[PDB]
Design a protein around this ligand. Structure first.
Ligand SMILES: O=C(O)c1nccn1Cc1ccc(C(F)(F)F)cc1
Ligand SMILES: [Zn+2]
Ligand SMILES: [Zn+2]
Length: 231
């Protein structure tokens, strides 16, 4: 079963096999007085591993690397952060110290600097405008437009039809937007429409936080985001 928030003490990381050579990583962290789960992705990249997002903090990200070594045993050589918040870049300094080359869009690197968050080393080119897609090893990176944040990326694994939505996509059980300080509520539904249009074949959809689902998570997120904008 997919691990839930109460099953992971803060500081531990679980891996979940989605498909051949495709895993999510699940961690937990405190935020605004509660503890929340958070997802990232791991994709086999030949003899190496590509990491999508940190495990939300230095300690968790160190535990992530240890669990990957224990369970998969291939080196993590590159990591992409899908936006500038701490559940995506928190732990980049640990990754860099471990020998991982860290990447993000120029916007994400800039926003992380402005916010005082950790800054991935390398800039991803070709993602500056809504609808842009680039290949990065075994995945496609897609910028759908502003949503959860202005810089948020999504990631698609063609070999398994896996769509990692990041924090732009909510889990089914989440019925409120909660904290949306950095969101673009007006653009979020349009950005979700671009995801739907670009990845209509997605079979597994991973939200930034919580349980995987299918393309229904896109319509669900639009519902929640709009309901928040109505009142
Ligand atoms: O919304 C975000 O992206 C976020 N990042 C860090 C903290 N949050 C708030 C958040 C709200 C609800 C959940 C859920 F209950 F779904 F697990 C998880 C996280
Ligand atoms: Zn975020
Ligand atoms: Zn988040």
């Amino acid at each position: 079963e997919y691990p839930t928030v109460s099953e992971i003490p803060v500081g531990e990381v679980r891996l979940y096999q989605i498909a051949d050579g495709v895993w999510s990583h699940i961690a937990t962290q405190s935020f605004d007085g509660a503890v929340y789960p958070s997802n990232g992705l791991i994709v086999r990249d030949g003899d190496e591993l590509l990491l999508i997002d940190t495990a939300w903090g230095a300690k968790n990200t160190a535990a992530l690397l240890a669990e990957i070594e224990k369970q998969i045993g291939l080196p993590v050589t590159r990591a992409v952060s899908t936006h500038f918040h701490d559940d995506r870049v928190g732990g980049v300094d640990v990754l860099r110290a471990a020998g991982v080359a860290t990447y993000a869009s120029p916007s994400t690197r800039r926003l992380a600097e402005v916010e005082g968050n950790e800054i991935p080393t390398h800039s991803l080119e070709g993602l500056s405008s809504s609808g842009d897609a680039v290949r990065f090893g075994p995945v496609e990176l897609f910028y759908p437009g502003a949503a959860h944040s202005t810089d948020n990326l999504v990631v698609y694994v063609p070999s398994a039809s896996v769509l990692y939505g990041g924090c732009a996509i909510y889990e089914l059980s989440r019925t409120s937007a909660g904290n949306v300080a950095d969101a673009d509520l007006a653009e979020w539904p349009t950005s979700i429409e671009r995801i739907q249009q670009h990845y209509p074949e997605a079979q597994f959809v991973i939200p930034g936080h919580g349980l995987p689902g299918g393309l229904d998570l896109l319509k669900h997120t639009t519902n929640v985001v709009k309901a928040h904008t109505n009142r």
